[PDB]
Design an enzyme around this catalytic site. Sequence first.
Site, mmCIF file in Angstrom:
data_model
loop_
_atom_site.group_PDB
_atom_site.id
_atom_site.type_symbol
_atom_site.label_atom_id
_atom_site.label_comp_id
_atom_site.label_asym_id
_atom_site.label_seq_id
_atom_site.Cartn_x
_atom_site.Cartn_y
_atom_site.Cartn_z
ATOM 1 C CB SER A 147 -1.090 -0.088 1.066
ATOM 2 O OG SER A 147 -1.921 1.060 1.041
ATOM 3 C CG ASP A 255 -5.659 -1.257 -4.591
ATOM 4 O OD1 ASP A 255 -4.979 -2.160 -4.088
ATOM 5 O OD2 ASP A 255 -5.919 -0.184 -3.999
ATOM 6 C CG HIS A 301 -5.636 -2.335 -0.290
ATOM 7 N ND1 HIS A 301 -4.958 -1.740 -1.335
ATOM 8 C CD2 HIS A 301 -5.258 -1.677 0.831
ATOM 9 C CE1 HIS A 301 -4.197 -0.767 -0.860
ATOM 10 N NE2 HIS A 301 -4.369 -0.704 0.450
HETATM 11 C C1 LIG Z 1 -3.989 4.073 0.263
HETATM 12 C C2 LIG Z 1 -2.754 4.817 -0.221
HETATM 13 O O1 LIG Z 1 -1.707 4.747 0.361
HETATM 14 N N1 LIG Z 1 -2.884 5.655 -1.390
HETATM 15 C C3 LIG Z 1 -4.082 5.825 -2.199
HETATM 16 C C4 LIG Z 1 -3.758 6.846 -3.256
HETATM 17 C C5 LIG Z 1 -2.255 7.033 -3.153
HETATM 18 C C6 LIG Z 1 -1.416 7.764 -3.991
HETATM 19 C C7 LIG Z 1 -0.054 7.733 -3.682
HETATM 20 C C8 LIG Z 1 0.409 7.032 -2.556
HETATM 21 C C9 LIG Z 1 -0.427 6.331 -1.709
HETATM 22 C C10 LIG Z 1 -1.813 6.381 -2.068
#
Ligand SMILES: CC(=O)N1CCc2ccccc21
Length: 357
Positions: A147, A255, A301
């Site tokens: 993530s 996701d 996820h």
């Molecule tokens: C859940 C998360 O960590 N997200 C979602 C959108 C995003 C864009 C760049 C880095 C992280 C994240």
Amino acid sequence: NEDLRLHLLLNTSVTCNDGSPAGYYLKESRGSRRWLLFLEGGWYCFNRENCDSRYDTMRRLMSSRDWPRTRTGTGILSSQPEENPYWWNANMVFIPYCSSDVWSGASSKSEKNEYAFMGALIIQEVVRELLGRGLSGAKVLLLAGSSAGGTGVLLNVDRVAEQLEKLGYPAIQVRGLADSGWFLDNKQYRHTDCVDTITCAPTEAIRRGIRYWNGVVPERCRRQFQEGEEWNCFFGYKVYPTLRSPVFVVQWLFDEAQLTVDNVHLPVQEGLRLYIQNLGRELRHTLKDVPASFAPACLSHEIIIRSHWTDVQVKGTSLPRALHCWDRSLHTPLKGCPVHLVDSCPWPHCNPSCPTG
Ligand SMILES: CC(=O)N1CCc2ccccc21
Ligand SMILES: *[C@@H]1O[C@H](CO)[C@@H](O)[C@H](O)[C@H]1NC(C)=O
């Protein structure tokens, strides 16, 4: 089993958000020269108000004061071959995410800063301290993460490589494994101008976060996008072509965090059906020229630290197998041991091996 042991950083100026020391959990494997350093995820915060709320009810992601002395390695961090066919005998490191900055920050708490955002420095300091605990003898350092930690791999893998080269360890091969960190800066299904945390899309939140965190991005990507546009480097399909270290990308095509930032919440009617199908197609398109990738057509996820990570397959090949084939490829394609595995079917769970939930 609680097999990874906590070490708080000896350099106590490298801190979590609230100034408590950052740290890492380690399980050594004597005689293995493989090191797996895993970056935890967990969203981010980008202003005083939303970081204050995260501090009330997500404090382990901002502070080490309440961390347990041990953690159990799971999935790719498991030391049991039954659970981890890929790297069960590796030295295992779990790096808690306590900087709320997608691992990009280089700012200390100070007279002007309520919080420290030190994600990029935490990674560097963990690496430096591990060199004295056996990492100096490594032949492969796999920087993995899920993530926000997967995005953290993309932002930091080449910096770890440069750090080791310039500390005098050119024989350590640095590689990345980015799980569920490959996001698209796409149009929301329903649109909300950025006036608060919930309405504020990731491009804008990251734009604000970079200034709030003193966030840093890989040099070649920074040089392409230039000042004020470094947010682009948090998007996998833009930063990946700039990277030199080998990076294996794991990404569900649908996701759940991508859908959340897209304001999709799951009888699906035509507009949403088309939106979801287009998202999977766009994701598949961005991975077409990523030679090491695993992208199943599932609504889910994260994967790599889940105990049942071995179960999903694309074209009959599991992720631990694909990662093993990747190791072999880094010793022309290999007979029956593929590394590029992207589903082509167009709807969540059109792959029968998707997680059941
Ligand atoms: C859940 C998360 O960590 N997200 C979602 C959108 C995003 C864009 C760049 C880095 C992280 C994240
Ligand atoms: C501690 O970490 C900070 C931040 O990276 C760095 O400036 C400093 O040189 C480090 N000090 C020691 C003694 O390692």
